[PDB]
A paper describes a structure:
The taste receptor type 1 (T1r) family discerns ‘palatable' tastes in nutrients, such as sugars and L-amino acids. The T1r family belongs to the class C G-protein-coupled receptor (GPCR) family, which commonly possess a LBD, consisting of ∼500 amino acid residues, upstream of the heptahelical transmembrane region, on the extracellular side. Here we report the crystal structures of the T1r2a–T1r3LBD heterodimer, with a variety of bound amino acids, providing a basis for the understanding of the broad chemical recognition of taste receptors. Although attempts to crystallize the T1r2a–T1r3LBD heterodimer alone were unsuccessful, co-crystallization with a Fab fragment (Fab16A), prepared from an antibody recognizing T1r2aLBD, yielded crystals, enabling structure determination at 2.2–2.6 Å resolution.
We found that a variety of L-amino acids, such as glutamine, alanine, arginine, glycine, and glutamate, but not D-glutamine, induced FRET signal elevation of fluorescence-labelled LBDs, which we had previously found to correlate with LBD ligand binding. The two amino acids displaying weak affinities to LBD, glycine and glutamate, gave poor or no significant receptor responses up to 10 mM, which is presumed to be below their saturation taking into account the several fold higher concentration ranges for the responses than those for the FRET changes observed on the former three amino acids, probably due to the assay method differences. In the crystal structures, these various L-amino acids are bound to T1r2aLBD in the cleft between LB1 and LB2. The α-amino and carboxyl groups and the Cα and Cβ atoms of the amino acid ligands are located at almost the same positions in the binding site in T1r2a, and form hydrogen bonds with the protein, including to the main-chain amide and side-chain hydroxyl groups of Ser142 and Ser165, and the main chain carbonyl group of Gly163, all residues in LB1. Not only T1r2aLBD but also the overall heterodimer structures were very similar irrespective of the bound ligand identity (Cα rmsds of 0.4∼0.7 Å). Our observed difference in maximum FRET changes in T1rLBD among the amino acids may reflect different occupancies of multiple conformational states, while crystallization apparently traps the single conformational state in this study. The crystal structures displayed that a wide range of amino acids, irrespective of their physicochemical properties, are accommodated to the ligand binding site in hydrated states.
Residue numbers in the entry:
A (entry chain B): 21 to 50, 64 to 350, 358 to 489
B (entry chain H): 1 to 137, 143 to 224
C (entry chain L): 1 to 217
D (entry chain A): 26 to 125, 131 to 330, 343 to 452, 456 to 466
The structure:
């Protein structure tokens, strides 16, 4: 693909006629000092999508798409400034105090991200007031499905209200009725634990115990209570609706008290390398996982190879201070399973906006109703995106009135022996469809609990 | 785990008063009513009353008003029951029992957790330690015994070889005669094992601070 | 006060058969859309255990062979199949009105084949004699049914004074009973007589089972 | 204008005088709140802030020769309140997103939902918020809300008191009706946590709106024979539940109110109210604020317009006085922090000393002064160490008769005063 040769070495800022704001968890706290490989990779996917759209002379013909990506640090204090900067007047660089922003042209026309539901609760109503479309590629709380509360929110991954229905349907399928649910203590894990419990109660499933793993604090004292309650309930099905970092601390302690049983994984750690790379993790038993059902971007890796070479060539000339030392060696960032299987969500987010812009500017393949006098108000873009239909690659993407997508789940299982993921079924609409014969049960006699 | 630990057996003089304790652990003490129950030998269960440990409100079966007094100590999670002006008719086993969860009212609650029970003996008679006599007598199996005679009050424990011998043991309920109790225990063992392997009857009588081990020797 | 009458008062059911216990309330124990009748199991010497709450809810950790039914004023506890460890007194309890009341209880006995007792006799120990007492002990071990008659005979004549008798509760393993009979004499009275006879009468034998020693030996 | 007062240092005031249901909008602009539904007790609170400032300006010992001014807002919609917020934080009617302003602190908002939307923007630069009504338990976390303080307690404490009431009586099946917002959902979570290990059984719960099919709600509660109904919700939602209860022939219940509606003035005087049963509640004790009555008789950019002339002074005075002292104390806590930040003495203040909002914050945290014989302090979390709760009962004269007390450092109820309908 020869348009690869023309791509620039600018990771987090691309000049353009119309700009998208991006928000990714690229450097977190361990002071945002700690690089998050997946967040960087998901940012690379936006880079790739935008380059590709600009190389397509029939999509936004003669109109260049640019962007500005910022690190969220999964922290309120950090994310607020980037979000406000998206709202400054395009020609001024400042945010005016106004009562009426209808004729006000923001520097960005739409926002891609953030990844985190905790983060959407920080900026969502702000961006909502400006009716700035935000498309999240990772935020799954059902809180955002109310458009009276979050007026401009879209996402390319499904609501967790569907994921827990998938989870409770699987548990019913395996005739388990006494289960324990563990969540990380913040928007995602809290909503997921509540949602799971109302659905488990409603679907005749007894929840023996509920627990929350701290994300500030030291989680270890809370964790030992949780594991105690799990052991003394003598339950062996545990649903873990958690972000990676607290789930690691959780399973670290599970191991050191060699507990086993069935473990149900939310999408946030169902394919996490940091969880699965823990010493003696293969001790814990069977891990069943749910992840968004996505295409693979076949061009992502080639793209990154070329990009990282161009960047290395340009390494001597900020979301990620140390990223200018990137190299073709670091192509592993995008080839990690986490990135690969979620990449389409970033991609579709960017293309969705692109196609919407195409329609708003009344483009055909040859030209757009666009010039340098053209002022883009995010609220006019929002009208187009409402209940939007778009073929992206081989996916027919449709947003409902809630901003939720027609994207379902792939049910998976961790196979310890070759450290891999096997596909054992799927969740599309409200239909869970799995094949029991495809499950490997990590037990004494290798049968099901 | 939920545990209701009641205080040990009591011998109380007639006319006197005594207090039974019930120490609660494994749950939030002030969350649930504590109930009390009387069982007289020849066993009918009778509800005495309950207490709300959160605020000390009490409710009694009529016949126990002025006879029993329920109190709690939140600092130590203990419920108390004082019995007053005791008669031989107050001789019984007394249970504390916690209300369960799921009843519409505190009235309708059932008892999901019980204490181990407190024996109360109302008597002027004095505390007497037991005399432990060995019972030695062929045949394939052989039966040996242990007579535990002339003690007061209840209880005593009997074991054989500290519990080594469990099977083929019968400990018979004590009998009261002239204000003294008598009980026996039998054990049946292989003839091959006895008299070669020692069979010892272990008797404890807490009331009189009495431990005894009797070796059953032949004759 | 609501009166609870349980029936029958007493019941023997073979291993593996069905046991049916009833409770009749003098007044309805229905309120709040529920029936506040509960069932308790009491093994000998132990606290009661809640089996069933609100007429038919099996409590956690109670085998499914126990179950309850009924409403208003008529309630049944069913045990199916009966197992060896199920002998107990079963109480119903109503909690609809203050004060809470319990039924009189129903004694469940495991029925089994009739078994004659294994009878042992023991003359007084030399140690008891040094105290001036003389207890002659008789064990009647592992019989069924519980009804038995023990006679004491000294030198051919029956003896009623000094006899103390005590039954065990039913055995978990083999559903039998045991009994001890103790004849307490003075040492002098013990030395006035030669032969001592323990005599057991039971529905398994037409004639008594007899154990004897002579004081000579 | 009522909403603006010139002064040497400005306090922001975040209020919601009018109510409007959330609704789709297609333009990025402020709501005309003045044309929506006037809320009398909220206006009273609005005035309480104006009174407090005027009182402090009248003082020669507190901020001597330093005037306090305010920018106040009527934000009937949390989503549309950002222009007003932008105004408070702007450095010259501009906002520069990347800097380490108009006001030195802010009083409000009234609801957890308003707060959650705007607080991050304030937290980022350690701009102090002193809320007079936001009771969400999450605000107790300093790492999340470092410059947030409040003068009302967390939902945990109010939930505690509510559970105390229930345990004082014999009912153990409970229905928890809660507002379909962060305030309501928080109370539910706290209610659940507290009663998990206890005789109390949550037999029914539902998030409720003015839109809720209350006939179906109450059908479900009756089918389950639940006698006790906790309604944990603000004025609009509480009146929805209770007016619907009167209209849908609900009888013989025990209603339990949080302090957001236990002193409601509309429901006790309502036709039919006595038929739904007995209303108990947790209430804020009526704190006398000397001078406020006179002040009211004297007093009678978007979101700075009341449109409420032809207003009765007696209606206003007699309105629900809850959160009066919280407002009063919030303004005073801020003025004291300024006083102490400027290092004022009894006689004078230094002047034209510039005060960055964050400087106020450490004095706010260390607040320790007396105010109407109460001691105003905050704990480690920025939660208030003052204020208590009454247990009340709605009697046959339409009054919330006090029948008991809850004091947070350890409940008494005179049960004979309660007449049961
Ligand atoms: C908030 O500002 C917006 C953006 O300016 C206002 O809408 C603009 O409103 C004016 C009406 O004053 C419209 O311009 C006028 O339009 C009419 C036709 O509608 C035309 O005949 C006049 O010559 C003049 O151009 C303009 O179209 C409109 N823009 C829109 C509706 O998108 C809006 O009224 C303001 N809202 C307020 C102040 O509440
Ligand atoms: C780089 O592309 C620009 C436009 O993107 C074009 O003018 C040029 O031909 C390209 N040069 C290469 C492939 O050497
Ligand atoms: C920004 O331009 C806007 C209108 O687009 C105007 O409101 C404001 O005065 C300008 N601010 C500057 C130049 O700082
Ligand atoms: C890139 O690779 C080198 C080692 O090959 C390493 O020092 C650097 O941290 C890597 N960056 C990544 C993996 O993001
Ligand atoms: C997507 O493709 C299918 C046919 O392949 C078509 O029915 C649908 O209209 C397409 N959607 C578009 C072009 O937006
Ligand atoms: C389930 O899996 C096994 C794969 O070997 C197969 O025998 C069976 O037909 C499958 N069921 C399906 C595909 O519906
Ligand atoms: C005041 O409010 C009423 C409705 O309550 C409205 O009709 C009227 O226009 C308003 N006056 C204004 C906004 O000046
Ligand atoms: C403040 O002083 C003025 C007199 O100048 C008085 O009218 C007003 O009532 C006072 N306000 C108070 C005490 O709140
Ligand atoms: C009070 O303030 C004025 C400035 O407004 C100042 O000129 C005067 O000296 C002050 N009086 C004092 C500090 O006593
Ligand atoms: C509603 O039910 C109550 C029960 O207290 C009855 O008194 C009342 O008259 C009924 N009213 C109706 C159906 O209008
Ligand atoms: C400050 O607080 C302490 C208690 O923390 C109290 O003893 C003292 O009186 C307070 N100072 C005042 C009110 O000036
Ligand atoms: C209701 O309460 C008020 C204030 O507590 C009291 O003054 C009045 O007498 C009461 N009305 C009654 C008891 O009817
Ligand atoms: C409790 O209430 C009763 C009836 O209102 C009254 O007689 C008595 O004074 C009260 N007791 C108190 C306030 O201690
Ligand atoms: Cl994020
Ligand atoms: Na002053
Ligand atoms: Na705080």
């Amino acid at each position: 693909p020869n348009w690869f040769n023309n791509i620039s070495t600018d990771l987090f800022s691309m000049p353009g006629d119309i700009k998208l704001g991006g928000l990714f968890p690229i450097k977190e706290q361990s002071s945002c000092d700690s690089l998050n490989k997946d967040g960087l990779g998901r940012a690379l996917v936006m880079k790739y999508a935008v380059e590709e759209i600009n190389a397509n002379s029939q999509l936004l013909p003669g109109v260049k798409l640019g962007y500005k990506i910022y690190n969220t640090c999964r922290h309120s204090a950090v994310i607020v400034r980037p979000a406000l900067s998206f709202l400054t007047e395009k020609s001024n660089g400042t945010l005016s105090v106004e009562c009426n922003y209808t004729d006000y042209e923001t520097d960005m026309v739409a926002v891609i991200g953030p990844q985190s539901s905790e983060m959407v609760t920080v900026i969502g109503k702000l961006l909502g007031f400006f009716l700035m479309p935000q498309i999240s590629f990772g935020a799954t709380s059902d809180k955002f499905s109310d458009s009276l509360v979050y007026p401009s929110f879209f996402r390319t991954v499904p609501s967790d209200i569907r994921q827990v229905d998938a989870m409770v349907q699987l548990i019913k399928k395996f005739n388990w009725n006494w289960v324990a649910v563990v969540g990380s203590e913040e928007e995602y894990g809290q909503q997921g634990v509540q949602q799971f419990s109302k659905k488990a109660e409603d679907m005749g499933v007894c929840v023996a115990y509920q627990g929350l793993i701290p994300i500030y604090d030291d989680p270890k004292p809370a964790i030992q209570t949780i594991i105690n309650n799990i052991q003394t309930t003598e339950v062996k099905v545990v649903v873990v609706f958690s972000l990676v970092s607290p789930a690691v601390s959780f399973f670290e302690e599970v191991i050191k008290k060699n507990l086993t049983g069935v473990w149900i994984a939310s999408s946030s750690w169902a394919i996490s390398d940091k969880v699965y790379s823990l010493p003696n993790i293969d001790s814990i038993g069977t891990v069943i996982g749910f992840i968004d059902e996505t295409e693979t971007l076949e061009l992502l890796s080639p793209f990154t190879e070329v990009l990282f070479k161009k960047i290395h060539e340009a390494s001597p000339t900020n979301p990620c201070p140390e990223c200018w030392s990137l190299s073709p060696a670091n192509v592993s960032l995008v080839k990690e399973e986490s990135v690969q299987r979620t990449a389409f969500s970033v991609y579709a987010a960017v293309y969705t906006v692109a196609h919407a812009l195409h329609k708003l500017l009344e483009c055909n393949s040859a030209a757009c109703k666009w010039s340098s006098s053209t002022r883009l108000y995010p609220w006019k873009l929002l009208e187009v995106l409402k209940e939007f239909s778009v073929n992206i690659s081989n996916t027919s993407l449709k947003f409902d009135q809630n901003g939720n997508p027609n994207i379902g789940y792939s049910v998976i299982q961790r196979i310890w022996e070759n450290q891999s993921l096997s596909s054992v079924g799927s969740y599309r609409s409200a239909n869970l469809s799995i094949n029991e014969t495809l499950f490997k049960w990590y037990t004494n006699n290798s049968e099901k609990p | 785990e939920v545990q209701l630990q009641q205080s040990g057996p009591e011998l109380v003089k007639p006319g006197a008063s005594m207090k039974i304790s019930c120490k609660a652990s494994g749950y939030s003490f002030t969350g649930y009513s504590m109930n009390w129950v009387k069982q007289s030998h020849g066993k009918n269960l009778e509800w005495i009353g309950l207490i709300n440990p959160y605020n000390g409100d009490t409710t009694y079966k009529q016949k126990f008003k002025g006879k029993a007094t329920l109190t709690v100590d939140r600092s130590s999670s203990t419920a108390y029951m004082e019995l007053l002006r005791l008669t031989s008719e107050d001789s019984a086993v007394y249970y504390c029992a916690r209300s369960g969860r799921g009843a519409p009212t505190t009235t309708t609650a059932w008892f999901t957790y019980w204490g181990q029970g407190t024996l109360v003996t109302v008597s002027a008679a004095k505390t007497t330690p037991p005399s432990v006599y060995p019972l030695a007598p062929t045949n394939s199996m052989v039966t040996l015994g242990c007579l535990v005679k002339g003690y007061f009050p209840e209880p005593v424990t009997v074991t054989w070889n500290s519990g080594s011998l469990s099977s083929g043991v019968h400990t018979f309920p004590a009998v009261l005669q002239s204000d003294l109790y008598t009980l026996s225990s039998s054990v049946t063992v292989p003839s091959s094992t006895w008299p070669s392997e020692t069979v010892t009857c272990n008797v404890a009588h807490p009331a009189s601070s009495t431990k005894v081990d009797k070796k059953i020797v032949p004759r | 006060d609501i009166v609870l009458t349980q029936s029958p008062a007493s019941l023997a059911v073979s291993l593996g058969q069905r046991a049916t216990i009833s409770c009749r309330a003098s007044e309805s124990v229905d309120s709040y859309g529920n029936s506040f009748m509960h069932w308790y199991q009491q093994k000998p010497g132990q606290p009661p255990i809640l089996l069933i709450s609100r007429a038919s809810n099996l409590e956690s950790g109670i085998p499914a062979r126990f179950s309850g039914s009924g409403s208003r004023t008529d309630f049944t506890l069913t045990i199916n199949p009966v197992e060896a460890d199920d002998f107990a007194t079963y109480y119903c309890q109503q909690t609809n009105e203050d004060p809470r009341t319990f039924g009189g209880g129903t004694k469940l006995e495991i029925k089994r084949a009739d078994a004659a007792p294994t009878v042992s006799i023991f003359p007084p120990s030399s140690e008891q004699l040094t105290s001036g007492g003389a207890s002659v002990v008789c064990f009647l071990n592992n019989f069924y049914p519980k009804d038995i008659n023990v006679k004491w005979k000294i030198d051919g004549s029956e003896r009623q004074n000094g006899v103390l008798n005590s039954w065990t509760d039913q055995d978990s393993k083999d559903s039998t009973y045991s009994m001890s009979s103790t004849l307490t004499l003075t040492k002098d009275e013990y030395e006035r007589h030669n032969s001592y006879t323990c005599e057991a009468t039971h529905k398994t034998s037409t004639s008594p089972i007899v154990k004897s020693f002579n004081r000579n030996e | 204008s009522e909403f603006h007062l010139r002064g040497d240092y400005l306090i922001g005031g975040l209020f919601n005088i009018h109510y409007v249901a959330a609704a789709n909008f297609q333009r990025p602009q402020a709501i005309d709140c003045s044309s929506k539904l006037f809320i009398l007790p909220n206006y009273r609170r609005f005035q309480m802030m104006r009174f407090s400032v005027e009182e402090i300006n009248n003082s020669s010992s507190l901020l001597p020769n330093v005037s306090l001014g305010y920018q106040m807002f009527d934000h009937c919609s949390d989503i549309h309140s950002f222009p007003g917020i932008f105004k408070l934080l702007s450095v010259n009617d501009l906002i520069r997103p990347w800097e380490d302003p108009n006001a030195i602190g802010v009083v409000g908002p009234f609801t957890s939902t308003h707060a959650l939307s705007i607080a991050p923007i304030f937290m980022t630069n350690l701009f102090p918020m002193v809320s007079y009504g936001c009771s969400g338990s999450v605000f107790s976390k300093e790492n999340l809300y470092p410059s947030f303080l409040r003068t009302v307690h967390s939902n945990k404490d109010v939930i505690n008191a509510i559970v105390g009431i229930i345990l004082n009586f014999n009912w153990r099946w409970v229905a928890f009706l809660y507002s379909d917002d962060d305030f309501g959902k928080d109370g539910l979570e706290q209610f659940k946590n507290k009663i998990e290990d206890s005789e109390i059984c949550l037999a029914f719960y539902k998030a409720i709106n003015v839109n809720t099919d209350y006939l179906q709600v109450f059908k479900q509660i009756e089918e389950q024979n639940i006698k006790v109904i906790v309604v944990f919700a603000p004025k609009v939602y509480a009146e929805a539940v209770v007016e619907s209860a009167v209209q849908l022939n609900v009888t013989n219940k025990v209603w339990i109110a949080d302090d957001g509606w236990s002193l409601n003035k509309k429901l006790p005087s309502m036709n039919g109210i006595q038929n739904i049963g007995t209303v108990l509640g947790v209430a804020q004790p009526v704190v006398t604020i000397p001078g406020f009555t006179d002040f009211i008789y004297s007093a009678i950019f978007c979101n700075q317009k009341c449109n409420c002339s032809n207003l009765s002074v007696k209606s206003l005075l007699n309105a629900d006085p809850s959160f009066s002292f919280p407002v009063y104390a919030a303004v005073y806590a801020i003025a004291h922090a300024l006083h102490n930040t400027l290092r004022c003495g009894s006689d004078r203040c230094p002047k034209n000393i510039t005060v960055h909002p964050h400087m106020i914050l450490e004095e706010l945290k260390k607040s320790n002064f007396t105010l109407l014989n109460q001691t105003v302090q905050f704990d480690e979390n920025g939660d208030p160490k003052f204020g208590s709760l009454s247990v009340v009962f709605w009697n046959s004269s339409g009054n919330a008769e006090e029948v008991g007390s809850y004091h947070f450092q350890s409940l008494s109820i005179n049960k004979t005063k309660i007449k049961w309908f």
